[PDB]
Amino acid sequence: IDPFTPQTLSRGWGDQLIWTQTYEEALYKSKTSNKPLMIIHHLDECPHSQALKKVFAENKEIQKLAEQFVLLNLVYETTDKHLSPDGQYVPRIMFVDPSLTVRADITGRYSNRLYAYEPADTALLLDNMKKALKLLKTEL
Amino acid sequence: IDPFTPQTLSRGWGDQLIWTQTYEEALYKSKTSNKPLMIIHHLDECPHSQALKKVFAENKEIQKLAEQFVLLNLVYETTDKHLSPDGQYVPRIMFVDPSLTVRADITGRYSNRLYAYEPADTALLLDNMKKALKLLKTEL
């Protein structure tokens, strides 16, 4: 019944983390865990990214989630217009329901905020992620 | 034809590495690259492993391969007597062909040395690994 050894054997799944590449791979690594998949599709050609990357270093919350989840880096035409409708821009913090389904339509409280990726919007960014990895239904 | 940017973008695959678990997963991650699979099955209950673990820290060669390949940690009955015949002991540095086949029968020059895992046998250990990740045939 009850567990044992109050100390996580493996210490930390993403104890180190890695530079993942290609969507599928990202999907599989998560698939093996049968858990929600988080993948921040980003690039650097657009100073825009450099914006989030700023507070990103201080927003320990972001990391905590970026390190314990999946990561993707794609700066070349590949995301077929079938994988994401308006997801044509850069800031594309996408998520995938347990079934490995890219539920990009996953919003939060103020769906009107997660549109203007402000240098300090980490609030919604974090809530969303924190919300994406949180189920709400199972039997109902 | 020729490549580009003399600086590997990813700057490293297992740049950070991770504490993998369960055979399958090991095969999974390896298969994603369709390359030879290296998995050092070990435990710590037996002071034996502690031996290799000694020079292991200095034998940069071992690491170099342990970091750029697969890793497995199993200290509980699981390796069915079908996965490895005499592989019942501890020092079980197993390998898997690109087809994800656990070719445990992979020996080296002195097949009589890799039997007595000496505190300094790293010589064969390294040669073997270095040899396991090296093909010899394709068309013939």
Nearest-CA distance B116 → chain A (Å): 29
Per the rule left: phi > 0, alpha: psi between -120 and 50, beta: everything else, B25 is: alpha
First to last CA, chain A: 26
CA contacts within 13 A on the Cβ side of B78: 12
Question: What gap in Å lies between CA A24 and CA B100, rounded to an integer?
Answer: 19
Nearest-CA distance B34 → chain A (Å): 13
CA distances from A137 to A33, A97, A134, B58 (A): 19, 12, 10, 52
Using alpha carbons, select from B48, B29, B49 the residue that is nearest to residue B38.
B29
3-state helix, strand, coil in chain A (%, to 5): 25, 10, 65
**Can you tell me whether residue B55 is helix, strand or coil?**
helix
Question: What gap in Å lies between CA A105 and CA A94, rounded to an integer?
Answer: 9
Across the A/B interface, how many CB contacts are shorter than 8 Å? 32
Whether A98 contacts A49, CB under 8 Å: no
Pairwise CB contact (< 8 Å): A15 & B19: yes
Nearest CB to A21: which of B10, B18, B28?
B10
Question: What gap in Å lies between CA A94 and CA B73, rounded to an integer?
Answer: 33
Could you tell me the two tokens for B89? 């002991």
Buried b (16+ CB within 10 A) or exposed e, A78-114: ebeeeebeeeeebbbbbbbeeeeebebebebeeeebb
DSSP A90-113: S-EEEEEBTTTB--TT---S-TTT
Using alpha carbons, select from A57, A58, A30, A54 the residue that is nearest to residue A44.
A54
Nearest CB to A28: which of B11, B15, B28?
B28
Whether B55 contacts B119, CB under 8 Å: yes
Residues ≥6 apart with Cβ < 8 Å to A75: A43, A44, A45
Contact list in A for residue B15 (CB cut-off 8 A) is 18-19
In chain B, residues 24-83 whose CB comes closer than 8 Å to chain A = 25, 28-29, 32
Cα of B88 vs its chain's centroid, Å: 17
Considering only CA atoms, give the Rg of chain B.
16
Helical packing angle, A47-56 and A122-132, nearest 10°:
80
Question: What gap in Å lies between CA B114 and CA B128, rounded to an integer?
Answer: 9
Could you tell me the two tokens for A21? 């590449």
Set out the domains of chain A in order of their start, with CATH numbers.
1-140 (3.40.30.10)
**Can you tell me whether residue A44 is helix, strand or coil?**
coil
Q: Which helix (H) or strand (E) holds B37?
A: strand B37-41
Pairwise CB contact (< 8 Å): B25 & A32: yes
Pairwise CB contact (< 8 Å): A15 & B18: yes
Q: Which helix (H) or strand (E) holds B50?
A: helix B47-56
